[PDB]
Design a protein around this ligand. Structure first.
Ligand code: RGG
Ligand code: CA
Ligand code: NA
Length: 305
């Protein structure tokens, strides 16, 4: 039973955790062979890789899209051989998922991590009045965003601020830009902000993920401004270490193990012509599985590392 798998780019920290977990599942299944592909952050490369997989005769595809909007294209490729597709990590439109009897998605409730992140920030903000550098009762923040259009970048960005505001904490956006989930790009964007006229007004750094938080931490260090708190999402090992050291104030566990597990289980079942959830406890709703996030910081760090 051969299963084709595309990872939008191996360079991506969190998808690295997910990929290795999926591979472990594959190694362990004596009956399954995974054909692993690095799409190198290029959807056209991914589309070509999918053609090759289907030419080689896979029984299922597990696809981590470069561009969420290419779901329809990928589905139409898979339809040619009636191959099931389990999309994961970047959610297609409901319209695209609904276009095929055998298109599934494994992910998260995107808004949830923004809400959890906003609650962590609110908690530390209240506990650390010194953070309010200009004493106006508001958080002056900058935000490092994920890929524009990515449902998680959009949700995390919207809901982190909405949650703070709903909890009665007013906020002011000094700047926002995308660092595309990437550590190095984030370092450069944070560097620029620390080198501009608004430098000394920045009170909190909000990042849509840990990789970008990590870039900001490096930049803060280069500028002698490590007193500015940094929040992320994912709970990468490296980020958990920064939480322990106080170089990050909080993050959110993105459950790579269960997302990898559900992706593999559904793909394998569908490869065999079985119901997607056969022999599992997954709750599939309109062909979608979602795995909870959990907040992590100094106060509960012990439960994760
Ligand atoms: O909601 C699906 C969840 O797996 C998305 O996770 C994010 O996925 C991004 C790439 O799609 C990137 O890996 C980032 O660090 C992750 O937080
Ligand atoms: Ca302030
Ligand atoms: Na195997």
């Amino acid at each position: 039973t051969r299963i084709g798998v595309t990872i939008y780019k191996y360079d991506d920290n969190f998808m690295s955790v997910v990929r290795k977990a999926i591979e472990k599942d594959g190694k362990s299944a004596p009956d399954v062979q995974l054909l692993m592909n690095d799409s190198q952050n290029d959807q056209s490369k991914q589309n070509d890789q999918i053609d090759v997989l289907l030419a080689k005769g896979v029984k299922a595809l597990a696809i981590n899209l470069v561009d969420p909007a290419a779901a329809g294209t990928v589905i139409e490729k898979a339809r040619g051989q009636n191959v099931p597709v389990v999309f994961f990590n970047k959610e297609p439109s409901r319209k695209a998922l609904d276009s095929y009897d055998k298109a599934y998605y494994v992910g998260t409730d995107s808004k949830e991590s923004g809400v959890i992140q906003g609650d962590l920030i609110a908690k530390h903000w209240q506990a650390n009045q010194g953070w309010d550098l200009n004493k106006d009762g508001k958080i002056q923040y900058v935000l490092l965003k994920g890929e524009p259009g990515h449902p998680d970048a959009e949700a995390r960005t919207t809901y982190v601020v909405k949650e703070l505001n709903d909890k009665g904490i007013q906020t002011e956006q000094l700047a926002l830009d995308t660092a595309m989930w990437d550590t190095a790009q984030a370092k450069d964007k944070m560097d620029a902000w620390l080198s501009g006229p608004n430098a000394n007004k920045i009170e909190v750094v909000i990042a849509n993920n840990d990789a970008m938080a990590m870039g900001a931490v490096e930049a803060l260090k280069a500028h002698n401004k490590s007193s500015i708190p940094v929040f992320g999402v994912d709970a990468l090992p490296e980020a958990l270490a920064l939480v322990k050291s106080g170089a990050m104030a909080g993050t959110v566990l993105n459950d790579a193990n269960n997302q990898a597990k559900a992706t593999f289980d559904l793909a394998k079942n569908l490869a065999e012509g079985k119901g997607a959830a056969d022999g599992t406890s997954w709750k599939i709703e309109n062909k979608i599985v979602r795995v909870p996030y959990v907040g992590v910081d100094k106060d509960n760090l012990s439960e994760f590392t």
